[PDB]
Amino acid sequence: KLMFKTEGPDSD
Amino acid sequence: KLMFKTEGPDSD
Amino acid sequence: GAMGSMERASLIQKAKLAEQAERYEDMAAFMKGAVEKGEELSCEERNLLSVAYKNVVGGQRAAWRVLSSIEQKSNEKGPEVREYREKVETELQGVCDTVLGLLDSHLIKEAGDAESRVFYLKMKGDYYRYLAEVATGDDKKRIIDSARSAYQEAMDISKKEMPPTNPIRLGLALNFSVFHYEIANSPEEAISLAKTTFDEAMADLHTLSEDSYKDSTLIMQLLRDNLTLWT
Amino acid sequence: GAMGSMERASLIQKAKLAEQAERYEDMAAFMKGAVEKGEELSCEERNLLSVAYKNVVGGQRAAWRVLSSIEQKSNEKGPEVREYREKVETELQGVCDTVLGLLDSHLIKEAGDAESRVFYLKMKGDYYRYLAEVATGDDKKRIIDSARSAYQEAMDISKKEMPPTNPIRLGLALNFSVFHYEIANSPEEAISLAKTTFDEAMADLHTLSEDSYKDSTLIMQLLRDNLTLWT
Ligand SMILES: COc1cccc2cc(C(=N)N)sc12
Ligand SMILES: COc1cccc2cc(C(=N)N)sc12
Ligand SMILES: [Cl-]
Ligand SMILES: [Cl-]
Ligand SMILES: [Mg+2]
Ligand SMILES: [Mg+2]
Ligand SMILES: [Mg+2]
Ligand SMILES: [Mg+2]
């Protein structure tokens, strides 16, 4: 799935 | 630590 | 709790060690133990708590998406794909419930400063959002509204009490805009929020030191990354 | 065991799903359950077992090295660094003991073909080697000799029963050479083993198909990588 930018560690 | 090549997934 | 016998300061020290060792499940357990000592958290401690659980839930979200995709494609191989997707989903929900439990007992009610209260309410929105990502039951609408309500309270406080460049305010707006885009099915609200947030921060950059400038522009770039994908 | 009620085939299916989801702790638990059904493992199943635990123990080894380095540097901040390094070390030893337990009950004693017996004895050497990496007690010498003995039995069988390009034989020689270099303090034995293994495989490549050629040269490159660092 296309995941958009969210705050903090890009851990997924 | 310098880790040398061993078999399989380089998981460390 | 299994951390009940360890000193608060020792738990925080070990959380930092665990972060260095990329042992995020340990890091989260240590920070949960520190929260349960009952004292309020400092700025650094709040961020340790958030980083820990963000890494844990991030691994679960990534795994859940892989399994959900395999499951969708498979919809004969038996019940195993559904069962294992359910297992990971239940573990993910457990982590979200744990974080929400810490916020409700009693981090939010003791948080009076804008920087702490907005931080915790943003977290509450975030973990209801992660529950919403996997929700399919008759509770999905209520989970979504719980996320919205937490984000909205955080937004109201942040607009009144923080400058538009404040990195906590910016990260809240970023996450609330993503909530709008793909949880609330409100792409127009998402774009509007992202644009206004970016533009109001840009106009306030002139007030900042070089270091604060760097902190603010980092999150502004994330807003712009999303806007680029959305428009 | 908690996997006692799940079908063998379902455990293997879920191990493959867990691998796709990068859920290696789950993958290892599923494969442990499959081993405990008591049937011998196929080639694919053996590799699922090894990949799962290699990923789990790899995360632990990396974390242990980070903490050990911090501990060495610190040698006042209190007992916390030592305590947390010990916690990770104990978990690592537990994983190694679990794998060794599966090999001893009863994978090795039922393994009669060279491909299975060498594979399991190599694993036994590997997990004693991982125990040796963290050993400091009066048991260190015996742990090292347990690794050596397992590797040596695997080597003797592989030289008699497998061609010099066999990828299992090659990976065994690779790991035994690293054992020599940094566990046994025998760099000359390590270099000699790596060189002879590489040269004897090179002379046998002409017998192989394009696909087998690719499998063998991949591990030969690992031998050469080590030789380059060692000479
Ligand atoms: C005041 O401290 C912080 C502010 C913002 C982020 C952040 C991240 C930290 C960490 N990942 N160990 S501490 C900290
Ligand atoms: C016969 O099957 C195999 C041979 C060698 C490696 C290997 C890795 C596998 C996996 N990582 N799922 S299966 C498999
Ligand atoms: Cl399952
Ligand atoms: Cl500890
Ligand atoms: Mg469910
Ligand atoms: Mg429009
Ligand atoms: Mg110990
Ligand atoms: Mg010499």
- Closest by Cα among C189, C218, C192 to C205: C218
Q: What is the DSSP string of C122-185?
A: HHHHHHHHHHHHH--STTHHHHHHHHHHHHHHHHHHHHHHS-TT-HHHHHHHHHHHHIIIIISS
On whether residue C126 sits in a domain, the answer given is yes
Count of domains observed in chain D? 1
The secondary structure of residue D205, as a DSSP letter, is G
* Cβ contact D80:C13 at 8 Å: yes
Q: For residues D119 and D187, what is the distance between their CA atoms, to the nearest angstrom?
A: 24
Label residues C146-177 b or e (16+ Cβ within 10 Å = b).
bbbebbebbbebbeeebebbbbbbbbbbbbbb
On whether residue C3 sits in a domain, the answer given is no
Contacts of C62 (CB under 8 A, 6+ apart): A11, A12, D21, D22
Amino acid found at D155? M
Question: Where would I find the H helices in C21-111?
Answer: 24-35, 43-74, 80-102, 108-110
On whether residue C87 sits in a domain, the answer given is yes
Rounded to 5°, angle at Cα D151 from D148 and D155: 130
Q: For residues D203 and C140, what is the distance between their CA atoms, to the nearest angstrom?
A: 64
Q: What is the CA(B2)–ligand 7 centre distance, in A?
A: 22
CA distances D43 to D18, D110, D223, Å, are 18, 14, 23
- Whether residue D72 lies within 8 A of chain C, CB to CB, comes out as no
* Cβ contact D170:B1 at 8 Å: no
On whether residue C123 sits in a domain, the answer given is yes
Q: For residues C158 and D224, what is the distance between their CA atoms, to the nearest angstrom?
A: 58
- Whether residue C213 lies within 8 A of chain D, CB to CB, comes out as no
* Cβ contact D55:D24 at 8 Å: yes
Main-chain dihedrals φ then ψ at residue C5, nearest 5 degrees? -90, -5
Cα C107 to the center of its chain, rounded Å = 15
Amino acid found at A4? F
Q: What SS3 state is found at C22?
A: coil
Q: Which chains touch A (3 or more CB pairs under 8 A)?
A: C
D87's enclosing H/E stretch is: helix D80-102
C-alpha radius of gyration, chain A, whole number: 7
Structure resolution, Å: 1.6
C-alpha radius of gyration, chain D, whole number: 19
Number of residues in chain A = 12
On whether residue D8 sits in a domain, the answer given is no
Cα D149 to the center of its chain, rounded Å = 14
On whether residue C1 sits in a domain, the answer given is no
Domain that holds residue D203: 13-230
- Closest by Cα among D55, A1, D21 to C87: D21
Q: Which chains touch C (3 or more CB pairs under 8 A)?
A: A, D
Q: For residues C31 and C123, what is the distance between their CA atoms, to the nearest angstrom?
A: 15
The number of CA neighbours under 13 Å toward the Cβ of D8 is: 10
Q: For residues D53 and C8, what is the distance between their CA atoms, to the nearest angstrom?
A: 34
> Which tokens belong to D178?
């690293």
What residue's CA is closest to ligand 2, atom 13? Answer: D44
Q: What is the CA(D20)–ligand 3 centre distance, in A?
A: 14
On whether residue C5 sits in a domain, the answer given is no
**Prior bond to D180 cis, omega within 30?**
no
Amino acid found at C40? E
* Cβ contact D175:D122 at 8 Å: yes
Experimental method: X-ray
CA distances C208 to A4, C46, C230, D39, Å, are 28, 23, 29, 68
CATH number of the domain enclosing D202: 1.20.190.20
> Which tokens belong to C14?
């070990």
- Whether residue C59 lies within 8 A of chain A, CB to CB, comes out as yes
On whether residue D1 sits in a domain, the answer given is no
